[PDB]
Ligand binder design. Structure first.
Ligand SMILES: NC(=O)c1ccc[n+]([C@@H]2O[C@H](COP(=O)([O-])OP(=O)(O)OC[C@H]3O[C@@H](n4cnc5c(N)ncnc54)[C@H](O)[C@@H]3O)[C@@H](O)[C@H]2O)c1
Ligand SMILES: NC(=O)c1ccc[n+]([C@@H]2O[C@H](COP(=O)([O-])OP(=O)(O)OC[C@H]3O[C@@H](n4cnc5c(N)ncnc54)[C@H](O)[C@@H]3O)[C@@H](O)[C@H]2O)c1
Ligand SMILES: NC(=O)c1ccc[n+]([C@@H]2O[C@H](COP(=O)([O-])OP(=O)(O)OC[C@H]3O[C@@H](n4cnc5c(N)ncnc54)[C@H](O)[C@@H]3O)[C@@H](O)[C@H]2O)c1
Ligand SMILES: NC(=O)c1ccc[n+]([C@@H]2O[C@H](COP(=O)([O-])OP(=O)(O)OC[C@H]3O[C@@H](n4cnc5c(N)ncnc54)[C@H](O)[C@@H]3O)[C@@H](O)[C@H]2O)c1
Ligand SMILES: O=C(CP(=O)(O)O)[C@@H](O)COP(=O)(O)O
Lengths: 359, 359, 359, 359
């Protein structure tokens, strides 16, 4: 049966999560996106936005609009291949969404204004049954990372959960292979050369929550603390309090890369780690962790759906020779694409794990 | 006696205006900046923004902070070499600004949200006498452009004037020399290759009133309609209805260039015009109109304070040989820097004219 | 009847011309690439450059490499979809290439160092029949433009042609409609906001041939002269010495746009001109001239094979109202994609005519 | 008797060395630039390159040109603030240089073509006394990093030395304070988020010795194996085989930052370290090592002339709380400016030393 989904806040990620569904072919098939919900309800504008993307190209499916009722000014309904997505009027209080009336049970919370466990739980009153925050949450919300711990998901306990962050979903799969393969992680420090995002600015402007982040983004290397490496602990309890790291926001519109440096728990070799990474990318991490041994550069990872793309050649070429513990692993990720697909995955995995618990 | 000034909206232009004041040694002499206003009153953060500038480099003059009164939580007063400046809390409604209790009579309206004669008049009700809008205004506000029509200022008839746009300010100087030297302007279409600004988005974001204006700002040549060229009709009435243009927002944090095409009212030559422009920049347009004959690029115009820098070589080298009517005039400008010096130039003018009206 | 082609200068445009063939399913079938050529003969590196592209995405046809004789040090054969290409050794003189023995009659000269009639003719002495200069030629080389004058090709007269400049291929299609649709062009100046190219520098460098051209490309707006507006006269004589213009190289890796300002021979409106362009694009200029009525930006025209894409909105919205002679036309173009496609088009047309020319 | 220096290879770096040299106010007084040597002799084009800079702003001193002898075709003399500098015609062999005749004892190697000890020795036979290669050198040439080991300069032993690279001059000061202050370095991996350089390309082009380095510079994050780290084992032998790292070339014209990670040789805290670096910057590292505790971004380091600017905030905030061995240190540097000044520093040092050993 179709999954009645409702996307909250049809922004950059909102549109990427939706386009994820389509790409994978889950529209009007496995997932029923009953309604999206951003600032306005100008379906014609929503069409244009989905249709054209500066970095990800032109949407592969044709988009069109229509009215939900002949008594409407501008088209208020989006049409993607027979399926009809409604654009409802945004809200300030999730508890005031027509989710119940619309028939939505799973909402993807991607506004960015409801990452608080209880704030997102407002969608439940609205009539939804499960919510997935497309970012790190707070309030004891369960954090799940596909291919790492999504199986810990519990249908009767977890109703508001987080898919975590783009960087966490990129780092986690590497730390996970390391620990599961027995290499271990004593202590680790990571840096992420990250492409600027919507939170940043075009020219120097006011940003009281992050002074460096208000500076002209496309012409600066902006440092920033991140809780991504420390969030790995939530997903891999064994590495709790053992990792941390920063981020250097740099002048590229999309795609980033993880720079991990850690000390293995036991003696090994970089060749050994390299081989363990590739082996899992083809097995238990397939579709989540991938790798490459080609001389690629950020642009080559655009539209890659893996959560983490290990860079074999950058890794094998920049470590200490004969070193048995102090290592560096490099991995790429399209911050927008990969994560967006993981959002659909987590949601799907939940619906299936929710079905079973019932019928 | 110095004139009490207050700057509403301390950003790109609010700050460059201040830096221009310090630079020309006017602070504490011709002008007494009583206070600035933005999001909060954290002087310490205001210092940081003033101290470091991504495009204009380190603020050459020292800046520290203190408290207006011990009963204040964090510092709220900026101190630039003895000159103290108060950081007031932003106001949703201009009429709610404590001007009359501060002593401020002139307020440079640069927040960007009160360009409507009616909405900007709120500064008068707050307790101020005059208000200069750092952008094209509406509502009847008299529009003045230094070196072109700024003498049409009526001390008693104008209380909320518009210093025009940055572009109008680069164009006017030229169209004035043409009209004044008798070259005349039959018809003209301008195109400004404008570097992006704060109203643009780092990544494809929401922008309902200007769709293309929402697409990624540092990786796209974004077209846009502009009033700048038309506005030249308000400063030089004989051109009203003869010009109009557009803007292409390209990937540069500062400095723009006007590409003016037009047909003269009489038979002339690009040489005659070239020589007319340089001659003018050395005479009646000195300070306002500048010009170069060197192989310059945008960065070379960074921090140039003129309103228009005629590019001799670009013009002469790219026109039709022997033509006597159809010409192209290229002229650069630091959309941030010069225009800011003009805002100060304008206020100063208004001050003298207001001092000589009742005296 | 696989046409015989030999690409000399397998670089930015050389590779694009190749990916141009494949895209149209002409490889092996209509056209047969015997052997390409650049500095080295490393097929692994060639294959790599082909597989991944920063602006145009990933190559859609698997590429592998083999040998032609085990006596070779590294793979020197480029197998693209079953069809195999040979990587010949670069020469300082076009006449030194084994075109004769290689059995290569047509040779797409895209090195950019032999835009001279005689120079490129070195290809004919090496054993080749026809030589197309994927760039503006000089020395009495017939310049053709698909959809504007390409039929002027004399199979038995023109053995060396010039497919003109990427800019002329965008302007001409536009001017061609104006002249033919009876609008006429009295005088015109054209400016092109062009994105940087391989001839520029990453950081300030030496460029004695073009001082401005030797300045940090990705952070400046470099002015530049151009002969594309003047070259139209060689393709549309009616305009001889009636058009010219410049270039403005901005910070973008690909896609450029024309901004033609001109006066019509007779009276009209922007509507009539807009209507003619949309008409011509759907009829006698289809495939060459296209148009858009959407809020598009630079990146949206990435991979557009048309030569000129007229921007309806940007044109109707930025001209003088009720005006009858002075006009501005805004037209886009993927300076890399479209052009490359025209190169193949001219090559296939020359074959079609060469064939029947004696058969 | 001011030192007679001659610059070999007046390129991006030859200038920076001369501009830095002028900045310190040494031209004519302490040092005396006799003549510079570059491919071309065009002095008007040299004065241009010296007059304006895309990143470092405009040269503060006046630059004009003349002729050394009335019997000279074009200008061959570059006159900087009164001081006279001759522009000798370049060469491919360091021997064919008239250093001795020119009376040049100290020549600065920035051509980037003679980084070899044996090769660069030509100057010596060219009558030139000593040679400072402004880049990593081979052939077992002595490396010297100002503030780290420049005191290992033996006049009668070293006549052709290397000033190491820009990155090493950033890492060395940091590692030197760590080793000399008791912390020690057991193992360490560095990463430099580096801005693109001249060796990179605007758009995807041919780069056989570095494939990723051939990709478009201002639109990608290009990884790269680096030596700087390992080259530290030459300046601080004790770390021989203990360090290494890579590089991420990001979209910025200038300014880079070093992100070093390592395990101390004893127990400490990120505070002890932080204090030790600040103490050193104020004492024995003054001028070479500097630090900041403000919220800085790359643009804020433009024109800083220290070799390493430690980022106190970025460091203290991104290390594991209570950690004792595994640490991250973030340090900035104007990869162009700092190094340039160091080159002058090494030369000034050598001089004084040579004066006392000879006198
Ligand atoms: N790199 C990425 O794009 C990325 C990757 C992973 C996770 N995330 C997280 O996902 C969230 C969204 O990120 P994004 O890149 O899409 O940002 P965005 O700013 O591009 O998208 C957020 C959208 O929310 C809409 N919005 C705001 N308030 C709303 C409201 N009350 N109701 C409805 N819509 C509202 C806005 O119009 C905006 O388009 C953030 O929490 C971010 O940290 C982002
Ligand atoms: N930067 C340019 O090129 C430029 C040139 C000429 C004219 N202008 C005009 O100047 C004005 C400001 O432009 P800018 O570049 O400085 O933009 P900006 O965004 O950098 O400056 C606006 C500032 O006002 C503050 N602000 C917002 N609402 C406020 C309120 N209610 N009260 C007080 N402060 C408030 C913001 O925090 C911000 O710092 C606009 O009207 C713009 O059109 C800009
Ligand atoms: N890319 C565009 O926008 C564009 C569009 C139309 C026409 N053109 C014209 O096409 C020509 C090439 O442009 P491009 O963008 O491909 O430049 P490019 O520099 O990227 O490609 C030229 C390639 O030729 C190779 N080369 C140099 N000398 C050679 C020789 N003797 N033999 C074989 N290979 C050699 C180089 O390795 C280089 O990669 C220029 O003349 C340019 O004016 C460029
Ligand atoms: N500023 C930096 O980023 C930096 C820092 C450290 C080391 N380096 C190294 O220093 C060297 C120069 O650096 P750069 O920034 O000037 O590079 P660049 O490529 O910008 O400048 C090199 C210049 O050398 C000139 N040249 C080449 N061969 C010559 C010859 N035989 N005679 C005279 N002139 C000649 C060229 O005109 C060219 O412009 C390179 O080897 C570089 O790797 C650069
Ligand atoms: O990448 C992120 C943090 P990092 O750069 O420190 O790894 C992620 O939170 C993006 O958030 P946005 O709110 O969409 O900017």
């Amino acid at each position: 049966m179709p999954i009645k989904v409702g996307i909250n806040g049809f922004g950059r990620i909102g549109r990427m999560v939706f386009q994820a569904l389509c790409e994978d072919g889950l529209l009007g098939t496995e997932i029923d996106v009953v309604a999206v919900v951003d600032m306005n309800t100008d379906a014609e504008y929503f069409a244009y936005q989905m249709r054209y993307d500066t970095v990800h190209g032109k949407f592969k499916y044709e988009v069109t609009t229509t009215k939900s009722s002949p008594s409407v000014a501008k088209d208020d309904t989006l049409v993607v291949n027979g399926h009809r997505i409604l654009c409802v009027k945004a809200q300030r209080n999730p508890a005031d969404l027509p989710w119940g009336k619309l028939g939505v049970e799973y909402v993807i919370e991607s506004t960015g204004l409801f990452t608080a466990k209880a704030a997102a739980e407002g969608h439940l009153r609205g009539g939804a049954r499960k919510v997935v925050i497309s970012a790190p949450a707070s309030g004891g919300a369960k954090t799940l990372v596909m291919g790492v711990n999504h199986h810990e998901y519990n249908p009767s306990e977890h109703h508001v959960v987080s898919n975590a962050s783009c960087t966490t979903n990129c780092l986690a799969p590497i730390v996970h292979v390391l620990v599961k393969e027995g290499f271990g992680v004593q202590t680790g420090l990571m840096t992420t050369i990250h492409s600027y995002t919507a939170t940043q600015k075009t020219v120097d402007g006011v940003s009281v929550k992050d002074w460096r982040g208000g500076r002209a983004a496309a012409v600066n290397i902006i440092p920033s603390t991140t809780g991504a490496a420390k969030a790995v602990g939530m997903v891999i309890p064994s590495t709790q309090g053992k990792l941390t790291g920063m981020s250097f926001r740099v002048p590229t519109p999309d795609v980033s890369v993880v720079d991990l440096t850690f000390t293995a728990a036991r003696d090994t070799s970089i060749q050994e780690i390299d081989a363990a990474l590739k082996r899992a990318s083809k097995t238990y991490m397939k579709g989540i962790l991938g790798y490459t041994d080609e001389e690629l550069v950020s642009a080559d990872f655009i539209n890659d759906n893996r959560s983490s793309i290990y860079d074999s050649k950058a890794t094998l070429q920049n470590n200490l020779p004969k070193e048995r513990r102090f290592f560096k692993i490099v991995s790429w990720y399209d911050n927008e694409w990969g994560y967006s697909h993981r959002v659909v995955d987590l949601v799907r995995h939940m619906a299936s794990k929710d079905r079973s618990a019932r019928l």
